[PDB]
Amino acid sequence: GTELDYDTFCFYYDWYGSEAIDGQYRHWAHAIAPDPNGQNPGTIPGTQESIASNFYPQLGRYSSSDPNILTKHMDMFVMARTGVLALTWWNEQDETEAKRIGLILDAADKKKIKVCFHLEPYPSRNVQNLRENIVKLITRYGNHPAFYRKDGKPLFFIYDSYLIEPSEWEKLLSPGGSITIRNTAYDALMIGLWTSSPTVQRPFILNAHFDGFYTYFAATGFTYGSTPTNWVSMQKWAKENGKIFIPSVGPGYIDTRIRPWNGSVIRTRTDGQYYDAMYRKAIEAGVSAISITSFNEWHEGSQIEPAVPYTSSEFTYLDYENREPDYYLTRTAYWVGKFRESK
Numbered sequence: 001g002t003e004l005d006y007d008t009f010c011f012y013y014d015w016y017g018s019e020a021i022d023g024q025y026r027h028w029a030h031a032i033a034p035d036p037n038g039q040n041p042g043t044i045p046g047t048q049e050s051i052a053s054n055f056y057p058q059l060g061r062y063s064s065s066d067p068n069i070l071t072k073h074m075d076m077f078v079m080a081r082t083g084v085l086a087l088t089w090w091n092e093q094d095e096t097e098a099k100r101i102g103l104i105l106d107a108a109d110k111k112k113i114k115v116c117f118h119l120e121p122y123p124s125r126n127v128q129n130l131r132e133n134i135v136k137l138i139t140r141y142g143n144h145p146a147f148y149r150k151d152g153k154p155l156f157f158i159y160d161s162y163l164i165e166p167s168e169w170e171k172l173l174s175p176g177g178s179i180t181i182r183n184t185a186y187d188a189l190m191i192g193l194w195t196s197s198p199t200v201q202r203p204f205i206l207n208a209h210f211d212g213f214y215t216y217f218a219a220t221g222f223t224y225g226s227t228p229t230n231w232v233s234m235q236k237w238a239k240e241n242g243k244i245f246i247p248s249v250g251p252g253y254i255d256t257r258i259r260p261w262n263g264s265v266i267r268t269r270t271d272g273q274y275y276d277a278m279y280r281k282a283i284e285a286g287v288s289a290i291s292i293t294s295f296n297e298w299h300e301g302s303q304i305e306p307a308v309p310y311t312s313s314e315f316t317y318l319d320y321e322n323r324e325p326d327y328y329l330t331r332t333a334y335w336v337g338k339f340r341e342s343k
């Protein structure tokens with residue numbers, strides 16, 4: 001009852017910097033989003049006192065490229081029993097991205113953690129450059145011992161997959177598609193983002209030839225897909241149609257340091273009871289895999305990574321009290337155990 005679970009995927013963000021490694025506190029400093037409804041909202045400067053999160057990391061303003069931080073993160077995945085790190089991927093095409101991905105794979109392998117990619121909506125993303133990038137990632141990293149495979153296939157999560165028409169997806173994902181990956185060296189499990197109602201999403205997923213779907217959002221009720229009372233029926237549909245459903249569960253949500261106008265999306269943690277309810281619903285739906293939003297999306301307040309109390313002259317941060325800083329790692333391990341009992 002301590003082993004890693006390789007059907008548990010934790011969304012991981014590698015965009016943080018520190019002075020020690022990067023020469024800058026990247027992402028800890030962040031622009032404030034204007035209200036979508038002549039605004040000069042400003043920027044959070046990423047100083048010790050004022051970072052782009054409502055919470056404060058136990059590890060401080062860390063770099064995602066610091067091998068010592070990465071070691072600690074992998075030890076945290078081990079504590080949480082989460083066997084797969086689902087790495088945000090933005091197609092930066094820069095040496096710093098390449099170095100960091102290699103460091104993450106190397107650190108993961110030391111702890112028997114696996115890595116898969118979460119393909120983000122990069123500029124001009126389309127099925128042709130997606131194919132090229134899938135080929136690139138499999139070619140570059142597919143022989144790394146930490147690269148994730150399920151039944152011989154890589155797995156990719158595709159964020160905002162609805163931004164691309166099913167007629168385009170079918171070219172890549174139907175066995176007869178014009179630029180198919182099916183039956184090729186680059187075949188993979190492609191997990192699209194289920195957002196809205198079944199009348200829209202069922203034909204989208206079928207016509208796009210996705211292997212499965214996930215829901216991402218940590219805030220219950222943000223979308224149809226992130227409303228856990230829909231998960232039993234979503235799983236039934238998935239099983240009937242040979243699709244893999246990977247619901248996303250998270251411990252809470254708050255992004256109001258970077259999106260001050262987005263308070264209606266706040267979901268309170270209630271000393272773990274929110275996380276418990278969401279994780280229970282995923283397990284009760286009878287799914288074969290679960291995704292966790294998030295390890296370390298600090299901007300969105302969905303992180304399970306340890307956080308500490310902090311009051312600065314500029315902001316009084318939220319924290320996990322009356323739970324301890326590692327509570328969400330140990331509670332994740334509890335739920336992984338419950339999930340494994342159900343498999």
Ligand SMILES: OC[C@H]1C[C@H]2N[C@H]2[C@@H](O[C@H]2O[C@H](CO)[C@@H](O)[C@H](O)[C@H]2O)[C@@H]1O
Pocket residue numbers: 088118120121159297299300
């Ligand atoms: O990983 C999927 C999305 C999840 C959530 N992290 C956001 C999205 O990224 C956007 O918002 C963050 C702030 O929360 C910005 O730092 C990014 O630049 C922006 O793309 C993820 O795409």
